[PDB]
Amino acid sequence: WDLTAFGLVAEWFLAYILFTRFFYVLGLAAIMQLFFSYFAVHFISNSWLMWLIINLVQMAPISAMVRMYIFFASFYYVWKSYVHVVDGCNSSTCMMCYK
Amino acid sequence: WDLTAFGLVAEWFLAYILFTRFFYVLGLAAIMQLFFSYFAVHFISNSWLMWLIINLVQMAPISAMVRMYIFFASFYYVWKSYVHVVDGCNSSTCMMCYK
Amino acid sequence: HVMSKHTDFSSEIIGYKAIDGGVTRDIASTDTCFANKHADFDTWFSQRGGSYTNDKACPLIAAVITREVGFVVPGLPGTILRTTNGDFLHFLPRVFSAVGNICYTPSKLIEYTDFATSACVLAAECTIFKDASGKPVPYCYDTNVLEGSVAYESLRPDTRYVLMDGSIIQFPNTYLEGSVRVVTTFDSEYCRHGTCERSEAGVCVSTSGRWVLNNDYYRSLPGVFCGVDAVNLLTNMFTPLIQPIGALDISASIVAGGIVAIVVTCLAYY
Amino acid sequence: VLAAECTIFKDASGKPVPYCYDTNVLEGSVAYESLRPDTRYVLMDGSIIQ
Amino acid sequence: LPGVFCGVDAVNLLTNMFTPLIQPIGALDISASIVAGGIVAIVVTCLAYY
Amino acid sequence: GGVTRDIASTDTCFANKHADFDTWFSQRGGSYTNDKACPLIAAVITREVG
Amino acid sequence: FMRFRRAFGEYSHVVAFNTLLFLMSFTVLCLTPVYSFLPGVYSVIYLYLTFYLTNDVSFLAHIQWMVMFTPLVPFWITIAYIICISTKHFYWFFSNYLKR
């Protein structure tokens, strides 16, 4: 349905607006979450890194991960804007608005 | 399906990523265990002390020993990074010359 | 040819049963298509509120009867009777009133509720096998049904047998049958009616009369115990009482464990 | 399970048949107690109860 | 859900009724006290007397 | 090789003459492929024959 | 060892056993993924052995064991450990405030 699905798509689209180097981590986590849903539940015991990764990727649903990434991205961008307000920009040639 | 070998390979890869001075002694232990398991018998006679050494080398659990080295190196690297960031270093022999 | 309805021997019938895939099974109201030769079955099914469509590609309907009617054909359950008009009929004779659907083990006869989860091996009174020379040889549970037949009890476990149609039967040796069963296996695949499975050598114990084989699939099922040896079985069954029930044992608590040691070591020196 | 004291159901042919807890309150109805378990039933609007 | 028991069969349900007992600690919140006491009494008796 | 020896489940090929050997060898969990180059089989009989 | 005893004053004895127990527990945890028998039997052996130690190191040993081995042990083992630890104080409390 519209309201139950369009919101998730809108959140996903808005996530790309606040782009960062950690976006690929969430992108890979989204693939991992779907991959071990129609597959896996196999490969038996032994080792611990693989099981640790499996537990980490299945920690929370995708929407919660997206919202948590959005929170941190918003805080990072706010901090960067605050830094840009006081200290000044490198490109003083354009004169920006602080000069 | 079974994937124990892939897990062991991943553990070895992660260990090689976290390189230290003491990786060589673990590699030597592994290769010595492989060599002793492969030939054995031929050059073991008398010398119960030698037999004890051979048995101790063969019975060492190499496959479950790399993981302890991982956690041992993790704290060392965290401490080194903390010292580098907070406190600084004076010796020019450090391999921090990259930056 | 078009199937027709008949009402002969209607007063001798207690109920009806369905035959699916060559094996008799109980009837549920959710089934939608059958092959029928009786008219009273319409009243039997309508009283339960069911409706169906008649087709030849659907399980047959057979009536449970209290009278010995028809004759026995090897490979077919129950008895077969042919009407005066040429149409054939199927019935389920019984000796005692407490009878549902009965399947044949190589030694005894045991009732079942589902063929897939029972000790059933064969569903026919008589079966015919290919001998060592490549010729058919009849077998029956009771040798009086057909002359020249060989008793089912004469068969032996861990021996390959081939029917007339090429099917293979292989059953393992057992030491106890009933509500609880114990079985022994070898490193070879065993096959039963319509299903062949692979298993490893060992010994298994079950609390129910369900089919048991030595593999991971049956080992994961509840109420099933297996082991490579009799002594190993006790250790395997007593292991879960002191071990968790999953792979939840994440070893990531060691960092927090060593945190205390580091803290106390620093605090003592300071 | 049951929404109200009296209800209505479709038969095998689709004709409506009244149902209720007691037949005395509505002539021509059939009591709920006669209904067998593990059986599919349908109402006027296609609702299914089993 | 608490207060709900299930199993494949009658014996299976009875055996599975004790499943939370072998679960690692941190599965119940309020009803932990009675589960703890039911083990404490058995342990203290079976050891200290027998 | 002109010498009689005991039989073990590890062996995998024989020259079979007796039919009942096929049933006897199966009970030990062994499987074999018939080749005349492989060692022959003999049966123990109390009765004086041959 | 003499150089180690030169520092840390009186508390070197407490430090040594605390380090040794931590190392042993770390080794046991490292051997866990293959040998599933260890978590229970090693805990039982540790509980048995903890009696032959001074209280000063015993408290640290109990704290370390409860922090480390708790999330991967059956509940009844933990409750038995708690009962065996607390019986020595339950006796005193019952004698001094409940007994007749």
UniProtKB/Swiss-Prot annotation, chain C:
Subunit composition and interactions: Interacts with PL-PRO and nsp6.
Entry's transmembrane regions: 252-270
Parent-protein residues present: 2794 to 3063 of 7096
Membrane topology recorded in Swiss-Prot or TrEMBL: Multi-pass membrane protein
Cellular localization per UniProt: Host endoplasmic reticulum membrane
Result of altering D187N: In strain: Theta/P.3
Lineage top rank: taxon: Viruses
Job description of the protein: Plays a role in the formation and maintenance of double membrane vesicles (DMVs) replication organelles. DMVs are formed by nsp3 and nsp4, while nsp6 zippers ER membranes and connects to lipid droplets.
Residues exposed to the Lumenal side: 4-251
Name used for this protein in its record: Non-structural protein 4
Effect on the protein upon substituting L234F: In strain: Omicron/BA.2, Omicron/BA.2.12.1, Omicron/BA.2.75, Omicron/BA.4, Omicron/BA.5, Omicron/BQ.1.1, Omicron/XBB.1.5, Omicron/EG.5.1
From Swiss-Prot, chain D:
Purpose of the protein: Plays a role in the formation and maintenance of double membrane vesicles (DMVs) replication organelles. DMVs are formed by nsp3 and nsp4, while nsp6 zippers ER membranes and connects to lipid droplets.
Protein's organism: Severe acute respiratory syndrome coronavirus 2
Subcellular location as annotated: Host endoplasmic reticulum membrane
Assembly description: Interacts with PL-PRO and nsp6.
This protein's name: Non-structural protein 4
Membrane topology: Multi-pass membrane protein
Gene from which the chain derives: rep
From Swiss-Prot, chain G:
Taxonomic path: Viruses, Riboviria, Orthornavirae, Pisuviricota, Pisoniviricetes
Protein's job: Plays a role in the formation and maintenance of double membrane vesicles (DMVs) replication organelles. DMVs are formed by nsp3 and nsp4, while nsp6 zippers ER membranes and connects to lipid droplets.
Listed transmembrane segments: 37-57, 65-85
Compartments where found: Host endoplasmic reticulum membrane
Lumenal side, ranges: 58-64
Cytoplasmic side: 3-36
This protein's name: Non-structural protein 4
Gene that encodes it: rep
UniProt topology in membrane: Multi-pass membrane protein
Subunit and partners: Interacts with PL-PRO and nsp6.
Organism in which the protein naturally occurs: Severe acute respiratory syndrome coronavirus 2
